[PDB]
Amino acid sequence: RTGLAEDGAKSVYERLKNDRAPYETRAQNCAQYTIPSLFQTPWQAVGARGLNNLASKLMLALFPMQTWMRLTISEYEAKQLLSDPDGLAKVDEGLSMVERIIMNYIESNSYRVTLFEALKQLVVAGNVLLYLPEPEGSNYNPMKLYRLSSYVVQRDAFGNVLQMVTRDQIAFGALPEDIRKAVEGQGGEKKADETIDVYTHIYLDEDSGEYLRYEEVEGMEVQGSDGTYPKEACPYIPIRMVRLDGESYGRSYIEEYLGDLRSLENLQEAIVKMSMISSKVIGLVNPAGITQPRRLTKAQTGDFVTGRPEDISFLQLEKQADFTVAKAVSDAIEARLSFAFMLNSAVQRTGERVTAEEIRYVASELEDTLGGVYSILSQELQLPLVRVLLKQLQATQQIPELPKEAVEPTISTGLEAIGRGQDLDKLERCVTAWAALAPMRDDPDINLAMIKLRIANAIGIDTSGILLTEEQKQQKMAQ
Amino acid sequence: RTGLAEDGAKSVYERLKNDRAPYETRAQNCAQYTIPSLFQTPWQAVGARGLNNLASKLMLALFPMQTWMRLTISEYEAKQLLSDPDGLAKVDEGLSMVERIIMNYIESNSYRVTLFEALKQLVVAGNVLLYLPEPEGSNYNPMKLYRLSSYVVQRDAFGNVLQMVTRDQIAFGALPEDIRKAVEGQGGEKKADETIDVYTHIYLDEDSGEYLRYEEVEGMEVQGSDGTYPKEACPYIPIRMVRLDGESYGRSYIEEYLGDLRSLENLQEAIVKMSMISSKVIGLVNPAGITQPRRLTKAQTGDFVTGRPEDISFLQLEKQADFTVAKAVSDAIEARLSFAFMLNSAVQRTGERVTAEEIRYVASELEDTLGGVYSILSQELQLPLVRVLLKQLQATQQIPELPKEAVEPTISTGLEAIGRGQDLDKLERCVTAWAALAPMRDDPDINLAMIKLRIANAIGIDTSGILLTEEQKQQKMAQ
Amino acid sequence: AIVKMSMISSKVIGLVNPAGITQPRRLTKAQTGDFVTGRPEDISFLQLEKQADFTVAKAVSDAIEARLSF
């Protein structure tokens, strides 16, 4: 074979590993000051608690136990079945069964627990790509996360992906049997401890636009694992926190705010260290004085010992005056970071009893920030995940066959998909605004048929199978 | 035998014991500053009280006395019985009897009391695996918890488990009779005191994908205990607090926040030690002065003694100035840890009378954190537990036989499963939104049949056996 | 400049008079609750004590922070 792997994947991995190195060190920097174990352990938990809340508060809105995508009938299909109501009813029933299948798959296949780490890592790193390869209908298809450190990607100036490579080091103890043999014959006498790196390369076929995979184990192949992928659906997904116009990767959310994060840690730790000095009781006996250490060190309470106070002092550094200046600043940054990590208690920074309304106003800002990040993250990670899972399930045919109208639907996400839809809110607000013109349903020179429409128009309902057609209006008026 | 135990389990235990050693020391560190007896006794209880609340507050939502899983009819089975209502009713009745069986089993078999320690340990340690081996319908099947220290596990880069080993040291006084003989018929005259380590090895059969067990007692076997396990259902469960992309184990929740926990202990204990010094009354008599200790030490109140005040002083270290600097920081960390241990009283950190609303906002952040951790922990520990118990009970046939439609159901957990379902909330909100279009049930040119659907669509009800079918609509209109 | 300033205020440096009896080693190593030979006068700490200027800087940083915020 040739193409983009003219001489293996390792070669392509090393070539891109130089473009990735800035993002990689940036990610390790962010991790150090927040929670390091995502790339020893820091002097504050402020950043840590923030990142934790940011992941929680994100996924609980993005990936809750509620159904959070709604498949809508394709526009042409909707048009083709116009005002054929029994069928359209059954179609929604069909896709809204699909709604449940993928969800009941996700909750059982343990996608959520990994998507947590995915968001955590996607926040501190900027990129963190996901494999959901083998449905294997019978058993667990666990999701697999490849953190920024142990993978690499290349893109074109548009956004499209050409080639990605992922390294996995497992030590030959926990290898599948096909590679265990393809390894121990070409290599040496291996042990469970040693450690083997299995690269994985995906090209874009340079004419028949489709992704091709193979698995390299030291300038070799797996002698079996190589499979194909269409461009539209690839079970190998590279997400992106904070896009850039070109490049290949994306910016850690927790970067622009690090300027202060670093400022806080290197200060916080000095304060903690300072406190540890203030707390230390050391007693300075004048060796020229009469008061001798032992008689005190051993003396219990209520005693009387020979000596005067002047022979003894205690360290008493008394630099509160500086401390208060350091603290007053540590809290000022802690507050700014708090607001930047969606952390309620941005509202309370001591002072006075912040009154009841400048809470629900500061709240609206925090909700705006989370909502903006939510919409981007939702739109980018949420839809690629759904589109891939939909195609995978259609291929295995765990989707008991549908009518023609539900082979290619559209994929509403976020609010619309859960109960509290705005489609709905528009619908019910119109119905009530229709109840409004009851006191003139017996209209002397007032045309309800027209108003009843213009209202639904301004609100923006479909008005399809709603306003009884001129013919159906006249037909029903006689009954 | 051979496979993954080419020469016993002890060998595999020792090989993996080196990969486990970092997690193990990390766990002992966490424990030291929280509650140490989970791996002498510390100077503060803050962390202790936090871990306690964290376990309580978790399990009370995860594992309450209420029924907290609901088995739903498999999707194909639902489709196959579409609009056959008497049967579907009876099906729900059937699984909702299964709902009660497993629960009545769990409450009687004392699962909750162990699952407490499981969560406590899973919080401080990162992993803590669970055995629920023998149903023994007649009596107690107690749950068995193997703490991180006395077990070990290996995984593949996917999540799947290959081999686990558990050590149990009991001293030959409390051994079953088969090992008691298989032990003293190899190794020595043994007393009730001595102490015997029984290892326990589980392979993945390297072609007929199924878990195989045996029980080793010193490079030997139990001569009986060896049994098999299918891959889908193993009564040997390894949970995971905070996943990692690879490895084998998981991260203690109480790790990233330790950075401050350690900082607090080593300070707190200095303060306590400082206080004990401040409280100590030592009286310094000048031996050159006239005032003599005896006369005072023995003198009662209201007396008059010969001497002047200048001959006597008291220790008076007077380093409040430093203390206030130390305290002001101890409380600042105490507050950040409190928030990180779901501890209400995160809201009150003295200052002023925190007003009425920036409580229910700081609450929403604490509920979000607990809710996120809950969803992961629920999804990971809750569903593996249920799936295992369901299969075990089906095998012993304590599940009086069901129709074909309830051999492989789906397993809803969390909110859906208890009364307050979102499925329910959507249903009732639609029904009321339908009551909304009563003032136009006598519709002049307004099609209710269509609106009454589109509402249930936007909300996301099934609409199955709800909107009377075109034929059933026309059939009932004549009656 | 404030962040930098704080970093200076936080820094604990202890000035032993080399003419005095109180010697660094015995303190640096001494744990809490101890007694060491020497007097307080031989030792001080840096104590820059320019809060007076800080407060003037802060009161202005926050005034601009407020206008930018809006």
Author numbering:
A (entry chain C), B (entry chain D): 5 to 43, 55 to 494
C (entry chain B): 285 to 354
Sentences from the paper on this structure:
The gp8 monomeric structure was then used for phasing the gp8-12mer 3.6 Å resolution crystallographic data (gp8closed, see Methods section), which yielded an atomic model of the dodecameric portal. The overall shape of the T7 portal protein shows a ring-like assembly formed by 12 subunits and with an axial central channel. The external diameter of the particle is 170 Å, whereas its height is 110 Å. The diameter of the channel (measured between opposite Cα atoms) is 23 Å at its narrowest section, which would hinder the passage of a B-DNA molecule. Regarding the shape of the portal central channel, there are two cavities, “upper” and “bottom”, with a conical and an inverted conical shape, respectively, separated by the protrusion of α10 toward the center of the channel. The electrostatic potential of the protein is markedly negative, both on the external and inner surfaces, except for the exterior of the clip and the tunnel loop, due to R368. The tunnel loop, a singular feature also found in other portal particles, is between α9 and α10, and only partially observable in the gp8 dodecameric structure due to its intrinsic flexibility. Therefore, two clearly different conformations in the T7 connector were defined: one closed (gp8closed) and the other open (gp8open). Although the first structure described in this work (gp8closed) would impede the DNA passage through it, the second structure (gp8open) would allow it. The closure of the T7 portal protein, as observed here, does not allow the passage of the genome and therefore the portal valve is likely to be in the open conformation during DNA packaging.
